[PDB]
Amino acid sequence: NIDEIIENRKLLVPYIKCTLDQGRCTPEGRELKAHIKDAMQTSCSKCTEKQKKGARKVVRHIRAKEQEYWKQILAKYDPEDQYKENYETFLAA
Numbered sequence: 101n102i103d104e105i106i107e108n109r110k111l112l113v114p115y116i117k118c119t120l121d122q123g124r125c126t127p128e129g130r131e132l133k134a135h136i137k138d139a140m141q142t143s144c145s146k147c148t149e150k151q152k153k154g155a156r157k158v159v160r161h162i163r164a165k166e167q168e169y170w171k172q173i174l175a176k177y178d179p180e181d182q183y184k185e186n187y188e189t190f191l192a193a
Contacts, residue, residue, distance in 0.1 A: 102153075102154040102157050102158055103157070105158070106157065106158060106161040112161075112162075112166070113169075114126075114129070115129050115132055115158075116162065116166065116169045116173075118130065118132070118133055119132065119133040119136050119137070119173065119176075120169075120172055120173065120176055121176075132154075132155070132158065135147045135151045135152075135154070135155040136155055136158065136159060136173070136177070137177055138155075139152075139155040139156065139159055139187060139190055139191075140159070140173065140174075140177040140178060140183060140186075140187045141177055141178065141183045141186060141187070142183075142186060143186045143187070143189060143190045144156075144190050152190075156190065156191060156193075159173075159187070159191060160191055163191075
C-alpha cells in the first residue's frame, strides 16, 4: 500500500534506502525498486497500470518532500541526465 508508506516517513525511508542499495529490501521493496528504476529510465514501460500509479505517487512525493533522497535517486538512475523526457512525461500523467 503506497499511501501508507509515503504517509509515514519511518516506512518510506527504509523503502528509499532499499532502492538506493543503502539499506535492506523487503520482497515488496525490491519490486518498488524495480518499478522506480523503470519509472525513472524507461517510462515505467514494464509496470502494470497499478504499479504505474503507485510508483508515480512514490517518486513524486520523494521529489516534493524528500529532495535529498530525490537527488540521490536521480544520481543512481539517471547519472548522465538522459532520461528526463521519459520520467517527466511519466510523472506528468
